[PDB]
Design a protein around this ligand. Structure first.
Ligand code: GTP
Ligand code: K
Ligand code: MG
Ligand code: MG
Ligand code: MG
Lengths: 182, 230, 150, 61, 504
RNA sequence: GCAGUCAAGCGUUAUAGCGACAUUGCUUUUUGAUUCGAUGUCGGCUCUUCCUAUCAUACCGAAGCAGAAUUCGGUAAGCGUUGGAUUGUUCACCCACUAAUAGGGAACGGCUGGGUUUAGACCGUCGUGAGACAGGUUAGUUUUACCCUACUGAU
């Protein structure tokens, strides 16, 4: 609690402007190959993680590319509005036979989905409001174990723990698992 | 009604008989109305009105200048055009911060008679593999809300800013004790991961770690801004 | 089905929405705080400012998002007609931008209330509150074109 | 074994987490062979954290 | 520097343990094999039994004897279908891994290769100065590897003698940046298209300018292509196709110094133009379309290909190497007569064009929608294949000189290798830490060189699909890279105002 | 917030240095998908008044405002602004009614629960110990008015 004001200076030095960490192409290749050959054992624990350029190491082949950013070519103003310059569809149909086949397929899929949601939702929630029926308020006892105080205690004990023991009930062990915490 | 029914109604029946005259007289009155608003509006509304008037006048002058200029009249490759974007540190001297400002006294006991615990009020970098000390032996407190892992680092060359992970704290200018505690204050020299910057040495080594200097107060603005020392 | 979508509330542009929400915070929350008051009172004052502004932005975004139809969920005739009229790609991209902005505003509000828990003076708490409101305003300013389109 | 793996840490802490009424307090009392943590059949008996010293280098939370 | 983890005590003991010697068993039984052509899908000889100790050279001689070309053999590469090549011998290739047993059959896919080899470039010959601004484009002469043309941002081009690594000629006719340079496929004239919306022709031997500049484009030139020698009738000079930002492609007759055709179908800026080997022109533009024009029909657009959702940045043809090389080969021999030059150019082009039944000229377009499309414009109008997987825009695409591989260099700091016939994905080349600008094959389709934004060149081995050598030395971004016809030199240029020459 | 760009100005005869309005990058990327340490003061009951930075009610202005409903804004404080659930915590959150369930000051520069709760007791952590606390639980007497003034009524 000393009240003296220190003289905070940084001296000129050429050590500030040099590279601090470098990695060779051979080392990058070795670590890229090693990332992938690891066979994790359930009885091995991580004591200390090696410092590596994981952004350069986490390269995974992907079968598909992300969608093209349409805003670069066409803006909202040209898409729709007083200054809109769009007059034709971007991807016109091949022909009217393909168009009507696609529309018939869409009609069939829409009807199937409507039946599938009419099995549960329409016979459930939607029908109740017509008669003025509202479900009773959810009881506050069922939200126990979800308070900010309890979860602050949980993050405190996790931050203080080196080993964490998750305790499961042998009657319903999958029921009593905290997957989000894990 | 469907589609542009108001426009169709205007086309079929016209407008009110005095619409044009009423609109013309209102537009003639607008100058007196603007002057009266400027002299009558008070408080925040008046200040906002003055600010908007200044902005409109600036925009009008720019439009006039552009029209007059028009009326008077990097060596990139083909695939890159039509596309857009001393060993002194930049902050040799910063404000001194005393221990009284740095630390907050935390009292313990039922009657709050013990005062041996201290809390760091500044943002910190604790590193990898950090575990909290047991509460009985925990004198220095670095709360988790104030711990930082990344910073917005501006590169002097190429004029870009990238969100980079923090590797270490090299020198806190206030004190070596703050350096080893990991305090992030203005003028602190930190080490940052520059893997996505694509830096290569003259010998072919990929650079993924360099030094940066913190140029703001994260305790004040809730974020860490730094300049990369190239 | 629904067959009509005239009951969508008015979508303000970015600057007008900013003026509405910020001036609502200024009018509807208390505005006098003194440096001589307790630090807990000062912290509560600025926490209330941040939380109220975030809630206002979020409720405007939610009113936008609930009102507009789901282009994929409607009948195929309505879907094709609205795709012809409004360019479904731009339609969904604008609504998704609104959703992303809502999530970002919520995140900023939570982070800065947590940071304001540790404020040590009126100046620091005021700086944190202004930082939160400025970050929210930058998020909202990044929605100028989608709001006009919507 | 965990203590031996962290022999350079001078102490380790083991935090017990899980659903209410799963028996964390009972397990800690079992390890200490003494009722050091309050136990009840009703959920939510434990309300705050508690440190228990099992050995000189091992703490339970 | 970050080091790999060191070996442990147990690993050191394992190393000190005695090693096993990969020896060929003397009791190795015969294996039943069937040959099969990769290009044509044809089998030769059926099921034939071969000794287990057969070498690759002996197998090659046996296959030549089976085909009946023992007097003039052509070396082949063998693979077995996973598909694994034959490196040294059959036992060490297949039986030693144990995937295929001795009793089972071996289906050997054979593929023709090049007679010669190109050594990888391992070192920088020299850093030659002379350009006052950043280097924008470069190319090698087709007839010899001792001549390089390099156009830069100081409104000039330079002809460099690569034997002594010294400047030879300065070409200072243009007014603005020299955006693109090109050499005539007969090696007679250099064509430069500049930022001042002009084109100029230069005699290289005298370092001189032929006539006045070619004018008519209202925007800057984007790409230059030459008419192929095998289509040029003897006694006449090839025509020059030019694209530009204004969206028009102009055809120039250099004999009379005139403009014959001005194609204008593109609504936006034309990215590139290519003069194919079947009397067609392929144009790619920022209007997300590819236009196929017929030169023989008064420049009438035969087809419009519309499958991309962004700017098509580049396009390439399967026979591009033969089109650029004309009649010359890697030995640098010059035909005596124009008739002989046309005939030899026709033979060289046909070597890539007419194979496995019917001649085809495949095209690949790399666009800004992170993808590529593989087309066969003569037979079908729909795209034959779609190549996806790049996470950012594909800046460059190149067909291998034999046409059996495609290489795409993207802005996601990666290169991708795809099959040339069906377009399926093969491999990814990684090691660049900044965006890859452009790429170049070697003459025998075994080595590749790429230049990147991270100031480095990289040579990759296509067969092993790994990085062969890493070449630093550029102090700033590298914009252009090229490999000589004979496979002896590589040139690179960029922001450092230096021409780097690389050799073995 | 940091780093940069532009230039209405200011400065100058050395295109040095300041610099409004604007603007770019990071925070934060496109198909509306899916709780992390407040270290020292809190909440009620009864009852009055004030502010306006107006939630409702009154009157207006604008908007693709057809009608109905709604959004933004102006004058405006005359008049209203609720009943409940929840303490293994609520520096709040849900249900409903309602015209509406607006914000705040006069404290925070009388009854009553949290709390400064001293002597009894138990558990946990630390200490060789007397004991102290990272802590957790329970039990525990402060009791005017007839004085002046103010206020309400009465001679
Ligand atoms: N049969 C059986 N009962 C057990 C066992 N362990 C605990 N219990 C019972 O389960 C109940 C829960 O005990 P606790 O120790 O309080 O469980 P907890 O997880 O600590 O619960 P909370 O403290 O309320 O969060 C107690 O009544 C125990 O008697 C066990 O191993 N076997
Ligand atoms: K319990
Ligand atoms: Mg318990
Ligand atoms: Mg008012
Ligand atoms: Mg006591």
């Amino acid at each position: 609690q000393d009240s003296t004001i220190p003289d905070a200076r940084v001296q000129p030095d050429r050590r500030w402007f040099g590279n601090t960490r470098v990695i060779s192409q051979d080392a990058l290749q070795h670590f890229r190959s090693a990332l992938g050959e690891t066979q994790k054992d359930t009885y091995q624990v991580l004591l200390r993680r090696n410092k590596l350029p994981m952004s350069l190491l986490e390269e995974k082949d992907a079968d598909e590319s992300p969608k093209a950013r349409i805003l670069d070519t066409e803006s909202y103003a040209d898409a729709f509005g007083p200054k809109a310059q769009r007059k034709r569809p971007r991807l016109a149909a091949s022909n009217l036979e393909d168009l009507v086949k696609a529309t018939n397929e869409d009609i069939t899929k829409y009807e199937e989905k409507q039946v599938l949601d009419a099995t549960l939702g329409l016979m459930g929630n939607q029908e109740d409001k017509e008669n003025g029926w509202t479900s009773a308020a959810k009881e506050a006892i069922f939200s126990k174990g979800q308070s900010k105080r309890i979860w602050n205690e949980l993050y405190k004990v996790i931050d203080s723990s080196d080993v964490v023991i998750h305790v499961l009930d042998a009657r319903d062990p999958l029921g009593t698992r905290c997957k989000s915490v894990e | 009604p469907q589609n542009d029914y108001i426009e169709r109604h205007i086309k079929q029946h016209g407008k009110r008989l005095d619409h044009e005259e009423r609109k013309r007289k209102r537009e003639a009155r607008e100058s007196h109305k603007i002057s009266e608003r400027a002299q009558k509006l008070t408080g925040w509304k008046g200040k906002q009105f003055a600010k908007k008037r200044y902005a409109e006048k600036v925009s009008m002058r720019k439009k006039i200048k552009a029209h007059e200029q028009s009326k008077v009249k990097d060596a990139l490759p083909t695939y890159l055009l039509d596309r857009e974007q001393k060993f002194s540190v930049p902050l040799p001297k910063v404000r001194g911060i005393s221990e009284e400002e740095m630390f907050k006294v935390i009292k313990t006991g039922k009657s709050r008679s013990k005062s041996w615990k201290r809390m760091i009020t500044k943002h910190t970098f604790v590193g990898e593999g950090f575990t909290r000390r047991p509460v009985k032996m925990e004198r220095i407190i670095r709360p988790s809300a104030l711990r930082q892992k990344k910073a917005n680092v501006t590169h002097p060359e190429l004029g870009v800013t990238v969100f980079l992970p923090i590797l270490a704290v090299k020198k806190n200018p206030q004190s070596p004790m703050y350096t080893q505690l990991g305090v992030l204050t203005k003028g602190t020299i930190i080490e940052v991961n520059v893997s996505e910057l694509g830096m290569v040495t003259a010998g072919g080594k990929v650079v993924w770690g360099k030094y940066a200097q913190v140029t703001n107060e994260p305790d004040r603005d809730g974020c860490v801004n730094a300049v990369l020392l190239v | 089905m629904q067959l009509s979508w005239k009951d969508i509330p008015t979508v303000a542009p970015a600057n007008d929405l900013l003026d509405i929400v910020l001036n609502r915070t200024q009018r509807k929350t208390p505005t006098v705080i003194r440096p001589g008051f307790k630090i807990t009172r000062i912290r509560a004052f600025y926490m209330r400012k941040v939380k109220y502004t975030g809630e206002g932005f979020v409720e405007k975004f939610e009113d936008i998002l609930k009102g507009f139809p789901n282009i994929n969920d409607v009948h195929p005739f309505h879907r094709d007609l609205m795709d012809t009229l409004y360019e479904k790609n731009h339609y969904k991209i604008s609504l998704a931008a609104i959703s992303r902005a809502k999530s970002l505003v919520e995140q900023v509000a939570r982070d800065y209330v947590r940071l304001l828990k540790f404020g040590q003076s009126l100046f620091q708490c005021k700086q944190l509150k202004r930082a939160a409101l400025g970050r929210m305003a930058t998020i909202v300013k990044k929605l100028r074109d989608p709001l006009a389109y919507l | 074994q965990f203590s031996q793996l962290h022999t350079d840490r001078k102490q380790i802490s083991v935090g017990f987490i899980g659903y209410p009424n799963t028996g964390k307090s009972s397990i800690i009392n079992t390890l200490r062979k003494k009722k050091v943590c309050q136990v009840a059949p009703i959920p939510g008996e434990t309300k705050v954290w508690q440190y228990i010293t099992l050995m000189k280098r091992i703490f339970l939370i | 520097s970050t080091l790999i983890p060191p070996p442990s005590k147990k690993q050191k003991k394992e190393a000190q343990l005695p090693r096993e010697v990969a020896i060929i068993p003397k009791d190795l039984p015969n294996v039943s094999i069937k040959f099969q052509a990769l290009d044509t899908g044809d089998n030769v000889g059926g099921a034939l039994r071969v000794p287990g100790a057969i070498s690759e050279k002996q197998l090659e001689e046996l296959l030549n004897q089976l085909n009946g070309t023992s007097d003039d053999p052509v070396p082949y590469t063998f693979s077995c279908t996973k598909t694994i090549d034959i490196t040294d011998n059959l036992y060490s290739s297949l039986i030693k891994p144990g995937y295929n047993s001795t009793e089972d059959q071996i289906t050997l896919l054979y593929t023709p290769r090049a007679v010669f080899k190109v050594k990888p470039v391992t070192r920088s010959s020299s850093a030659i100065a002379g350009h006052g601004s950043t280097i924008l484009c470069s190319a090698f002469a087709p007839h010899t590897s001792s001549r390089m043309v390099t156009g830069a941002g100081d409104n000039t081009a330079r002809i460099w003698d690569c034997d002594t690594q010294t400047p030879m000629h300065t070409l200072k006719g243009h007014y603005n940046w020299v955006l693109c340079v090109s050499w005539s496929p007969d090696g007679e004239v250099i064509a430069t298209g500049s930022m001042d919306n002009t084109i100029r022709l230069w005699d290289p031997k005298s370092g001189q300018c032929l006539g006045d500049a070619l004018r008519g484009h209202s925007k800057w030139i984007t790409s230059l292509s030459w008419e192929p020698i095998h289509l040029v009738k003897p006694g006449s000079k090839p025509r020059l196709a030019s694209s530009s930002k204004d969206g028009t492609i102009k055809i120039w007759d250099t004999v009379s110094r005139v403009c014959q055709y001005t194609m204008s179908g593109h609504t936006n800026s034309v990215s590139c133009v290519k003069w194919g080997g079947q009397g067609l022109l392929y144009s790619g533009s920022h209007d997300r379309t590819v236009r196929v024009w017929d030169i023989n029909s008064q420049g009438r657009c035969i087809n419009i290909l519309k499958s991309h959702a962004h700017w098509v940045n580049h396009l390439s043809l399967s026979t591009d190497y033969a089109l650029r090389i004309g009649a010359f080969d890697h030995t640098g021999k010059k035909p005596s007569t124009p008739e002989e030059a046309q005939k030899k150019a026709l033979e060289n082009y046909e070597k890539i064009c007419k194979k496995n039944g019917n001649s085809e000229e495949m095209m690949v377009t790399a666009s800004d929608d992170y993808t590529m499309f593989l087309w066969n414009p003569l037979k079908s109008t729909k795209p034959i294949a779609r190549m996806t997987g790049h996470q950012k825009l594909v800046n460059h695409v190149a067909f291998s000189p034999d046409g059996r591989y495609i290489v795409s260099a993207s802005f996601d700091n990666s290169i991708k290798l795809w099959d040339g016939r069906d377009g399926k994905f093969i491999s990814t080349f990684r090691g660049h830490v900044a965006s890859v600008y452009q790429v170049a094959w070697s003459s025998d389709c075994r080595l590749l060189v790429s230049c990147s934004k991270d100031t480095t060149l990289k040579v990759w081995d296509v067969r092993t699909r790994k990085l062969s050598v890493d070449l630093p030395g550029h102090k700033d971004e590298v914009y252009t890279v090229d490999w000589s016809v004979d496979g002896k030199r590589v040139c690179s240029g960029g922001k450092d105002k230096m021409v780097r020459l690389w050799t073995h």
